[PDB]
Amino acid sequence: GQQMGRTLYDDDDKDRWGSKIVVVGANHAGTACIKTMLTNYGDANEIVVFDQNSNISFLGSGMALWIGEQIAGPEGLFYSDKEELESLGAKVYMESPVQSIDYDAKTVTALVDGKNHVETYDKLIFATGSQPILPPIKGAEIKEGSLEFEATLENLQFVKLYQNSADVIAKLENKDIKRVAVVGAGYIGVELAEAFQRKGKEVVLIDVVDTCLAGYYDRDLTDLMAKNMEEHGIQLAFGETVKEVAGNGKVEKIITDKNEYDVDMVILAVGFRPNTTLGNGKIDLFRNGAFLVNKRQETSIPGVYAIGDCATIYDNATRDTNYIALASNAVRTGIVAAHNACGTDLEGIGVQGSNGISIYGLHMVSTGLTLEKAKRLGFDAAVTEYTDNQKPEFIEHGNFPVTIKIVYDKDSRRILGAQMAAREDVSMGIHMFSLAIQEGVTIEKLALTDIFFLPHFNKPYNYITMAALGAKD
Amino acid sequence: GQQMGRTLYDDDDKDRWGSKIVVVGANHAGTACIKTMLTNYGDANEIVVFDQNSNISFLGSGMALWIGEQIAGPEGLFYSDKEELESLGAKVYMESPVQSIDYDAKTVTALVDGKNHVETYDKLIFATGSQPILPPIKGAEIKEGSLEFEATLENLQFVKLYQNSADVIAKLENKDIKRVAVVGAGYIGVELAEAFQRKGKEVVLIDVVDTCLAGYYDRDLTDLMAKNMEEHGIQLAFGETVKEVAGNGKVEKIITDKNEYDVDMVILAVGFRPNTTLGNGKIDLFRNGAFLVNKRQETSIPGVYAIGDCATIYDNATRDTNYIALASNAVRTGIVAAHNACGTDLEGIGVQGSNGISIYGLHMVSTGLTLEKAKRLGFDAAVTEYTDNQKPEFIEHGNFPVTIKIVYDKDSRRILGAQMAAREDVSMGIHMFSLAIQEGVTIEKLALTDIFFLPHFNKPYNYITMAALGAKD
Ligand SMILES: Cc1cc2nc3c(=O)[nH]c(=O)nc-3n(C[C@H](O)[C@H](O)[C@H](O)COP(=O)(O)OP(=O)(O)OC[C@H]3O[C@@H](n4cnc5c(N)ncnc54)[C@H](O)[C@@H]3O)c2cc1C
Numbered sequence: 001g002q003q004m005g006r007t008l009y010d011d012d013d014k015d016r017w018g019s020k021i022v023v024v025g026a027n028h029a030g031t032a033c034i035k036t037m038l039t040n041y042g043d044a045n046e047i048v049v050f051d052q053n054s055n056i057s058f059l060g061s062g063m064a065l066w067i068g069e070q071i072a073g074p075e076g077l078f079y080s081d082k083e084e085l086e087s088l089g090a091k092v093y094m095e096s097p098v099q100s101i102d103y104d105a106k107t108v109t110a111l112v113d114g115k116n117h118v119e120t121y122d123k124l125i126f127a128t129g130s131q132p133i134l135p136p137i138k139g140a141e142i143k144e145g146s147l148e149f150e151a152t153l154e155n156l157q158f159v160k161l162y163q164n165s166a167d168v169i170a171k172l173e174n175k176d177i178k179r180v181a182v183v184g185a186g187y188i189g190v191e192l193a194e195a196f197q198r199k200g201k202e203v204v205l206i207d208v209v210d211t212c213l214a215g216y217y218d219r220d221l222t223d224l225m226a227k228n229m230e231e232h233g234i235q236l237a238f239g240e241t242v243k244e245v246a247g248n249g250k251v252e253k254i255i256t257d258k259n260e261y262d263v264d265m266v267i268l269a270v271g272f273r274p275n276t277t278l279g280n281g282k283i284d285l286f287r288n289g290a291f292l293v294n295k296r297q298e299t300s301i302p303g304v305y306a307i308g309d310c311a312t313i314y315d316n317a318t319r320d321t322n323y324i325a326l327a328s329n330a331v332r333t334g335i336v337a338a339h340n341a342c343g344t345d346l347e348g349i350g351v352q353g354s355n356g357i358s359i360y361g362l363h364m365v366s367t368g369l370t371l372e373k374a375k376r377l378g379f380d381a382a383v384t385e386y387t388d389n390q391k392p393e394f395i396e397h398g399n400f401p402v403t404i405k406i407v408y409d410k411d412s413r414r415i416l417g418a419q420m421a422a423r424e425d426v427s428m429g430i431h432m433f434s435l436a437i438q439e440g441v442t443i444e445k446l447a448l449t450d451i452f453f454l455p456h457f458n459k460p461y462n463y464i465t466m467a468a469l470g471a472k473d
Numbered sequence: 474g475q476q477m478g479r480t481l482y483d484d485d486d487k488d489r490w491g492s493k494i495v496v497v498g499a500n501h502a503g504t505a506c507i508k509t510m511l512t513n514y515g516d517a518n519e520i521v522v523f524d525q526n527s528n529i530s531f532l533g534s535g536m537a538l539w540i541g542e543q544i545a546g547p548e549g550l551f552y553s554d555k556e557e558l559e560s561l562g563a564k565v566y567m568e569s570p571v572q573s574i575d576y577d578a579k580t581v582t583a584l585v586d587g588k589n590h591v592e593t594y595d596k597l598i599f600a601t602g603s604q605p606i607l608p609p610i611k612g613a614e615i616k617e618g619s620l621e622f623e624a625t626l627e628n629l630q631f632v633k634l635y636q637n638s639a640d641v642i643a644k645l646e647n648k649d650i651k652r653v654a655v656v657g658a659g660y661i662g663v664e665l666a667e668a669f670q671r672k673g674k675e676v677v678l679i680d681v682v683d684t685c686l687a688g689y690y691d692r693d694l695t696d697l698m699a700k701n702m703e704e705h706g707i708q709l710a711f712g713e714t715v716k717e718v719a720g721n722g723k724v725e726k727i728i729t730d731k732n733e734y735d736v737d738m739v740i741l742a743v744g745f746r747p748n749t750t751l752g753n754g755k756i757d758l759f760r761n762g763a764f765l766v767n768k769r770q771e772t773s774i775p776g777v778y779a780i781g782d783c784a785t786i787y788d789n790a791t792r793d794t795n796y797i798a799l800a801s802n803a804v805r806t807g808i809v810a811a812h813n814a815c816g817t818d819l820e821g822i823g824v825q826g827s828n829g830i831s832i833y834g835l836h837m838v839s840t841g842l843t844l845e846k847a848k849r850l851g852f853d854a855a856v857t858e859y860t861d862n863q864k865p866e867f868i869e870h871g872n873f874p875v876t877i878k879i880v881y882d883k884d885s886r887r888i889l890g891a892q893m894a895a896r897e898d899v900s901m902g903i904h905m906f907s908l909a910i911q912e913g914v915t916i917e918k919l920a921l922t923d924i925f926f927l928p929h930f931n932k933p934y935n936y937i938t939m940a941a942l943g944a945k946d
């Protein structure tokens with residue numbers, strides 16, 4: 001598991017009011033925030049929690065691992081629970097949806113055991129996350145009133161909760177499910193494509209765009225990832241807009257503008273949107289509905305905070321407010337918010353959208369902006385790349401080539417992003433680029449950065465130094 | 474190999490000066506400097522090189538690899554040579570030791586083919602490196618006039634040149650060599666101890682200090698490494714000062730202030746000191762004798778630079794001038810001196826003493842100051858550490874524990890160093906810390922740094938984040 005004690009920000013409460021803090025949502029962001037408040041300021045504040053689901057902390061990435069038989073079962077895909085939060089001092093109401101907030105009276109109303117439950121608060125923290133987007137596809141609809149995204153058509157699956165994952169695992173126990181279509185080639189769909197193929201199904205990955213992982217890796221790497229999937233039995237249907245999902249009583253065929261595929265199941269991995277309705281317009285929202293928050297995760301309403309996927313985050317690569325739905329950001333915004341609502345002044349430092357993906361032996365990582373996105377967003381970006389073996393050629397075993405791409409602002413010279421891909425795990429190296437971007441390090445300064453040398457680990461003239469020195473523009 | 478075109482610093486000679494540039498020494502630092510000058514400013518300058526040895530670019534780290542038989546031979550241990558430098562445009566005199574310098578007439582006097590050769594210069598760049606340290610030990614003497622560190626006593630070996638390595642190898646063909654004594658428990662001595670053990674020799678590792686690797690790791694990790702060596706039969710004799718190496722015509726035993734050992738071969742790996750004799754007292758020196766240089770690698774004599782093992786370097790961990798004999802520094806200082814010497818203003822950024830070591834499957838990396846070293850320097854330091862598995866417990870294979878230590882200043886909160894140990898390669902990780910120290914990142918800021926999450930690579934609450942968040946002091 002993963003549980004600690006007091007963080008290093010924990011400030012001595014001099015003369016601050018003892019606040020009653022209500023948290024809406026106790027998943028990845030909520031749990032992080034709650035535990036931080038309890039393990040750091042304990043009894044000084046009354047923590048009350050509401051979550052409409054029946055479970056919390058389910059690791060989304062566990063869905064593909066489970067389906068792809070990379071792990072025996074669901075055990076371990078949860079790292080905390082109600083009992084764990086109560087043992088730290090929180091009062092937890094599960095399966096209790098908060099349905100309205102009164103910012104003037106400072107109360108929230110939730111549905112506890114079918115009955116309006118009113119709870120007062122001094123500080124309010126929204127950790128309501130997001131929910132999957134239903135695309136305009138004929139035949140794709142959710143059963144009215146469903147709270148677990150259940151499609152009306154049998155075998156049309158959504159991605160979001162543990163229930164959704166178990167649903168698929170169970171259905172897959174049906175020998176009639178031989179062909180699966182995965183809609184959306186972002187990292188979620190890519191992993192699910194591999195997962196289904198690994199389970200032994202026929203998979204067709206469909207996306208309106210011409211390649212996979214378009215928002216995080218440049219064409220060289222996405223092409224590589226696509227080739228990787230193809231060489232494993234996954235059929236690629238890029239550049240196709242899904243029109244309809246048909247069948248008689250269950251999924252039987254998916255129709256795009258360029259083809260028709262016979263399939264026994266369709267998975268929608270098209271993205272999510274923030275759950276901010278409780279705001280009731282009283283709170284400033286980002287263009288996508290996310291609660292707009294400053295670096296202390298505070299909303300436009302004092303004493304009201306938003307964290308995780310229901311709120312924005314500061315992107316150091318673009319140097320603007322942004323929206324990055326990642327468990328990593330959920331944990332940090334939760335930690336930042338916890339300290340502030342408890343009276344400790346703590347400014348967040350922004351994020352770079354660092355991410356990693358591992359598909360059939362191909363390991364990739366990236367952080368910041370790809371060259372294409374940097375340009376599309378108006379930066380005079382350039383990229384410097386290099387492909388070389390990780391270790392000196394004289395090393396007899398465990399060597400392998402690594403490709404690195406360092407994107408930088410030709411103008412200001414600051415690093416805007418980096419990408420790495422290799423057949424072995426070099427993911428630890430992306431951390432340096434995350435920090436580099438956060439700190440505003442230039443491609444020039446980076447080139448001279450002290451990168452150690454040991455033949456067992458790298459080359460004297462390693463690919464990082466070489467890529468940086470090779471910068472042109 | 475490891476060659477390239479122009480660096481990103483290559484500045485267009487608006488209206489600069491071309492110079493006659495003489496380089497003394499063409500090994501790691503020299504070759505890096507020479508190639509940078511010739512590759513970026515080609516014909517604008519005239520480059521003459523002098524090196525007293527008969528070969529250059531030999532990677533010292535391969536010595537242990539060679540003896541311990543982890544690699545085929547020494548072939549890939551060279552990455553450049555006389556012909557490559559000359560074909561780049563430099564005049565190269567191999568086996569030509571510069572015996573004196575006239576700073577007034579701006580001439581160097583070398584011994585070329587038994588006769589003196591006077592070369593005039595506009596700019597002088599010292600890359601004379603270092604030579605092995607030889608404390609006063611009875612029976613330990615280098616042959617008079619030997620420029621190859623050949624001991625007068627048969628089987629008393631030094632660790633410096635390719636020839637030294639080739640020598641030991643040849644001597645190991647002598648069935649009589651059964652037990653080896655390694656003097657010096659730094660990384661070189663530890664690596665050689667493993668190498669001789671692998672060759673099936675009986676090894677006794679001797680050091681004045683109570684532990685191995687005292688300069689780069691804290692007692693925890695060094696104790697771990699000690700046990701690692703003992704686990705393979707290496708006898709440790711720490712806390713002992715070698716007083717004499719005895720033998721009737723050849724090494725028969727070595728004696729310390731606490732004991733005596735019967736050995737057949739003795740290797741001295743006590744350390745290195747700068748070769749700055751040519752300074753002739755006209756150039757300011759550092760406490761240890763190294764040419765004292767600034768951020769541009771220039772000595773106290775305008776037009777005269779010094780790089781690599783013969784000069785100092787700026788340490789961002791201590792935030793002061795320091796001496797750190799590493800190839801990584803040789804390379805970077807050489808690149809900076811090249812640009813500056815050729816008219817391109819380029820200020821160096823300093824180094825952190827980043828380093829790595831791999832012995833019997835135990836991989837460790839460190840950068841900056843250890844807690845003990847920080848304190849030995851007067852820093853009010855503290856360390857925050859953590860040990861946990863690399864990935865979630867639910868991961869089937871490839872998981873392993875990692876121990877991380879982060880040393881910081883209790884007052885400024887500035888990060889001073891970091892160490893990592895695991896039985897799987899997490900070396901890429903030390904780079905982020907090396908950059909952190911360079912950029913003066915605080916432990917609080919580091920705790921909030923964007924570290925991605927992907928079950929295949931790490932845990933949501935990874936050990937770096939956890940360690941940082943746990944800064945108690
Ligand atoms: C298949 C998949 C794979 C992923 N893989 C990775 C990965 O490998 N690495 C990574 O960093 N990220 C990954 N993510 C993203 C990560 O899971 C999300 O960023 C994270 O779950 C967001 O956490 P959150 O707490 O902000 O929101 P959510 O997970 O959306 O949780 C919000 C919580 O609040 C509750 N709630 C909402 N409204 C109310 C209400 N009105 N009243 C009471 N309770 C309410 C909900 O029940 C829920 O428990 C993945 C996501 C998916 C779907």
Ligand SMILES: Cc1cc2nc3c(=O)[nH]c(=O)nc-3n(C[C@H](O)[C@H](O)[C@H](O)COP(=O)(O)OP(=O)(O)OC[C@H]3O[C@@H](n4cnc5c(N)ncnc54)[C@H](O)[C@@H]3O)c2cc1C
Binds near residue numbers: 498751
């Ligand atoms: C066994 C061993 C293992 C090592 N492992 C690592 C490691 O894994 N990682 C790492 O980063 N570093 C390592 N190092 C350190 C690294 O080798 C040195 O930091 C580096 O060699 C210094 O390069 P240099 O060019 O400054 O000096 P040197 O290598 O000392 O070379 C100086 C050159 O100048 C010439 N010269 C000297 N005086 C004169 C003169 N008067 N006239 C003409 N020519 C002259 C010499 O012949 C020589 O070629 C190791 C060293 C050893 C011995």
